[PDB]
Design a protein around this ligand. Structure first.
Ligand code: NOK
Ligand code: CA
Length: 883
């Protein structure tokens, strides 16, 4: 006591009606607030700062409810003060939570589970507290800097206008890159020089200085970094991949170049990044990770990178001009794990709202990135505008004409402004596009000529509009704000259609990304229409893992397409995540520096030696087996690596874990296993190489995925055929195979869910518990259910981003299979019939757990011996000895 029984109010961000926020606080147990959407929390204001001692919660029924409670004394930071996570039913007595006399002027109650419904409810909440006679501070409004007012603008224009200073900046930066990549002690071993292009082509040179140093030339930063990487690869037996394993062991003394090389590239652009990459991989990156990525980019020849960092701030400024408060902008914008699908006009709100601190920090990080890109000569691809608006835009802007875009995977797509209207009508496309490009100037300045936007990505609705005319006006509006603008358009599954593309009246000022050139090339339509286009290796879908690459097509199809085209202005990568198969990415970027088809077999041989720091006859044969199996050329259509059955929702006739995925292994399994035998045989010799271990974990977990499939098939034959003792035995081995897999996965820092979760929880500083918990939800949801019930199930997104990850395998994948088995056993043993499992409910239970109250996943890899684990795999859990 005493009960705060006066002056209290409540807000909510959604409700079924008329089950509205205030009904949670009316002193009436028969009336209740109930959620309608994914905002499953209410905010209660206490009429002043109290020292809470108790909070009492009643629900509308007797279901099992789980919730987390947060308080704020400053009006900004909401910290967790209490929670219910036990499995007790609610009853007429309510739940009483003892508080330790915490100062609170506001409280948040986030009901994360209702065992009975997708909706949550609070019938009543009483708060018990001592009045401090204080009030909450006024919360400060979001205030960001204008680019021109910042130290960033001065630097940007100084570099821009001053050759000598720009050259000095660039050369000193490449020096810094050397120190970051191989070590500070090697910096002074290189001399870097700016030269001209080679017949209008980007170009580098590697030669001796005369006094034992390496002299590297290049027309810009990326050429210089590419020359630095050429030298390491071809003279030092060194290989750099900050994400997927390196060998950075330098020779004791710097090896001579001998004959000077001059290497040019026929491609104006080398492109990197899907919109999805920003979500599946980069959601929770800090500057350390970004800087490290741009170093790897520059070193692989990349000079065109997609960039959406801080675009939340650009849009906030845009929407503020058209009737939207900052709270409403925050409700529009998704959480930090979802920006790919938010900027692709597919989904809103989900994972949000972002903290207020978000905007300033992200604008700053993007400003930082453009400074570094400027030194290298990497063009960012900023945002274009195509008419995207919230669904309530007309409400707030009545003369506005809009087009409803329908659903995407159970999500409500944002609206789209009519790209043109009739005479006599207000043209809001022109109004919002004018503000949008203007505001993107104010945040970042004139940093780029390349702008990316993609109306009607994976659905939508063109309404009454002419398809060509839509693309004409989008481009003409873009060129109006930058006369040198190039519209970067994705080419995904035959869209945009030809007649949309024919509406582009300035062909040289668009550039189409052929997204999936290595499985499903679709550039001939673009080439015929004289559109500048880029050949891209997509490769990776959703971050889903497995041994999968197309190195032969990369080594042949790229130069072939150059020879057979006039408008191929580049090559690139469009992966949905960068987490898998480094060979694939190194070869693609290596193909920029050649006009001829190469030998993918001898390129691998060379590759593996510099990646491991050494090679032998046996390692080579193991890799040839891989080239002959998992990496063997194929001519069918498929999206990513063949999927592991371990990662699939349990059932009969499973042919995938994700909706558009595939689990059919197209190579001989016993033949692939030979690679693992050879790796285990050579483990002791090669365990000094971290990239060897990484590659060994990759093939071994592939082996167990492969054999898991066979054991799965045998065990549900056993169920179907009535036995019995058989099913139990085979299902026993299946679960044990997963426990061995889990140990294989504990070995790599990159396979740890704890790194993923912690990165999310700590990506900002000064964060409250509310924000950390919410960013953890984003991290957990993405790799599992993706959205909520209607996105996971009806929307088809269940386990789209399934990861063969430690912790996730123990507590999610293994748990599902164990239950299903447990399960069919109770049936087969004279019980049951086995009930229908509501899988989403089980998956979403894990999604909503918090690291600081439930279980904290490790950020430290284990010392398990992959050679030993491999022996156990071959002996006990293989196809070869399967029986
Ligand atoms: C849910 C998801 O990630 N969907 C992606 C499917 N593949 C397309 C091509 O990369 C993407 O545009 C979608 O966002
Ligand atoms: Ca009530």
């Amino acid at each position: 006591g005493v009960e705060i029984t006066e002056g209290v109010t409540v807000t909510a961000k959604g409700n079924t009606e008329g089950n509205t926020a205030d009904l949670a606080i009316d002193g009436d147990l028969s009336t209740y607030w109930e959620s309608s959407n994914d905002y499953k929390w209410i905010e209660v204001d206490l009429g002043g700062i109290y020292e809470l001692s108790k909070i009492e919660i009643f629900n509308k029924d007797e279901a099992v409810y789980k919730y987390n409670i947060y308080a704020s004394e400053d009006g900004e930071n909401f910290n967790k003060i209490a929670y219910k996570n036990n499995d007790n039913v609610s009853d007429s007595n309510g739940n009483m939570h003892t508080i330790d006399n915490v100062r609170a002027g506001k409280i948040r109650i986030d009901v994360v589970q209702n065992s009975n419904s997708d909706r949550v409810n609070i019938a009543e909440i009483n708060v018990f507290g001592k009045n401090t006679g204080e009030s909450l501070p006024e919360v400060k409004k979001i205030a960001t800097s204008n680019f021109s007012e910042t130290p960033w603008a001065t630097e940007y224009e100084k570099f821009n206008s001053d050759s000598a200073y720009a050259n000095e900046k660039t050369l000193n930066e490449i020096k810094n890159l050397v120190g970051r990549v191989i070590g500070r002690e090697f910096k002074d071993k290189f001399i870097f020089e700016i030269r001209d292009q080679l017949n209008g082509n980007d170009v580098f040179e590697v030669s001796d200085s005369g006094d034992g140093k390496v002299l590297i030339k290049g027309n810009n930063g990326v050429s210089l970094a590419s020359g630095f990487n050429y030298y390491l690869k071809n003279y030092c037996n060194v290989s750099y991949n900050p994400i997927m394993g390196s060998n950075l062991k330098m020779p004791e003394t710097m090896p001579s170049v001998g004959e000077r090389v001059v290497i040019d590239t026929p491609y104006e652009h080398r492109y990197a990044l899907n919109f999805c990459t920003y979500s599946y991989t980069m959601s929770f990156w800090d500057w350390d990770q970004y800087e490290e990525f741009l170093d790897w980019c520059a070193m692989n020849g990349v000079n065109l990178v997609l960039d959406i960092i801080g675009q939340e701030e650009v849009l906030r400024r845009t929407l503020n001009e058209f009737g939207y408060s900052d709270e409403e902008v925050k409700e529009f914008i998704s959480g930090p794990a979802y920006f790919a699908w938010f900027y692709m006009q597919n989904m809103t709100g989900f994972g949000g709202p972002l903290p207020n601190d978000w905007f300033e920090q992200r604008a700053e990080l993007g400003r930082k990135m453009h400074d570094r890109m400027q030194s290298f000569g990497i063009n960012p691809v900023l945002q274009g505008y195509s008419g995207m608006v919230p669904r309530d835009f007309k409400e707030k802007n009545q003369e506005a004409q809009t087009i409803s875009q329908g659903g995407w995977c159970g999500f409500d797509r944002p609206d789209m402004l009519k790209t043109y209207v009739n005479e006599g009508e207000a043209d809001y496309f022109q109004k919002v596009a004018d503000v949008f490009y203007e505001k993107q100037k104010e945040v970042f300045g004139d940093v780029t000529n390349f702008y990316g936007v993609d109306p009607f990505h994976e659905g939508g609705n063109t309404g009454d509009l002419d398809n060509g005319k839509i693309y004409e006006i989008i481009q003409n509006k873009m060129i109006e704000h930058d006369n040198d603008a190039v519209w970067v358009i994705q080419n995904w599954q035959g869209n945009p259609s030809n007649n949309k593309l024919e509406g582009l009246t300035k062909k040289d000022q668009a550039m189409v990304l052929d997204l999936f050139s290595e499985v499903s090339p679709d550039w001939n339509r673009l080439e015929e229409r004289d559109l500048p286009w880029i050949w891209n290796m997509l490769h990776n879908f959703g971050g889903r893992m497995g041994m999968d690459a197309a190195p032969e097509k990369l080594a042949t199809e790229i130069p072939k397409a150059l020879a057979n085209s006039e408008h191929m202005v580049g090559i690139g990568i469009t992966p949905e995540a960068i987490n898998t198969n480094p060979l694939a990415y190194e070869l693609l970027f290596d193909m920029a520096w050649t006009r001829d088809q190469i030998n993918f077999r001898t390129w691998t041989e060379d590759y593996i030696e510099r990646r491991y720091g050494k090679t032998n006859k046996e390692i080579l044969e193991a890799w040839n087996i891989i080239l002959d199996t998992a990496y063997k050329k194929r001519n069918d259509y498929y999206q990513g690596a063949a999927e592991s059955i371990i990662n699939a929702r349990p059932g009969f006739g499973i042919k995938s874990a994700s909706t558009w995925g595939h689990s059919k292994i197209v190579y001989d399994k016993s033949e692939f296993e030979k690679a693992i035998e050879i790796f285990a045989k050579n483990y002791d010799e090669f365990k000094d190489s971290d990239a060897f271990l990484y590659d060994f974990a990759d093939i071994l977990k592939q082996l167990l995925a492969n054999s898991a499939q066979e054991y799965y098939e045998v065990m549900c034959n056993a169920y179907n055929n009535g036995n019995g003792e058989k099913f139990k035995f085979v299902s026993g081995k299946f679960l044990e195979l997963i426990k061995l897999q889990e140990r294989v996965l504990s070995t790599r820092p990159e396979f740890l869910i704890g790194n993923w979760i912690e990165d999310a929880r700590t990506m900002l500083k000064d964060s409250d518990d509310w924000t950390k918990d919410l960013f953890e939800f984003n991290a957990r949801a993405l790799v599992t259910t993706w959205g909520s019930r209607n996105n996971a199930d009806g929307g088809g997104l269940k386990d789209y981003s399934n990861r063969q990850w430690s912790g996730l395998t123990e507590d999610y994948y293994y748990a599902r299979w164990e239950k299903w088995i447990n399960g069919l056993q109770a049936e087969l043993d004279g019980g049951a019939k086995a009930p229908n499992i509501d899988w989403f409910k089980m998956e979403y239970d894990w999604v909503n757990k918090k690291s600081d109250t439930d279980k904290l996943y490790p950020t430290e890899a284990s010392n398990e011996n992959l050679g030993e684990l491999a022996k156990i795999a071959m002996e006990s859990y293989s196809v070869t000895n399967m029986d």
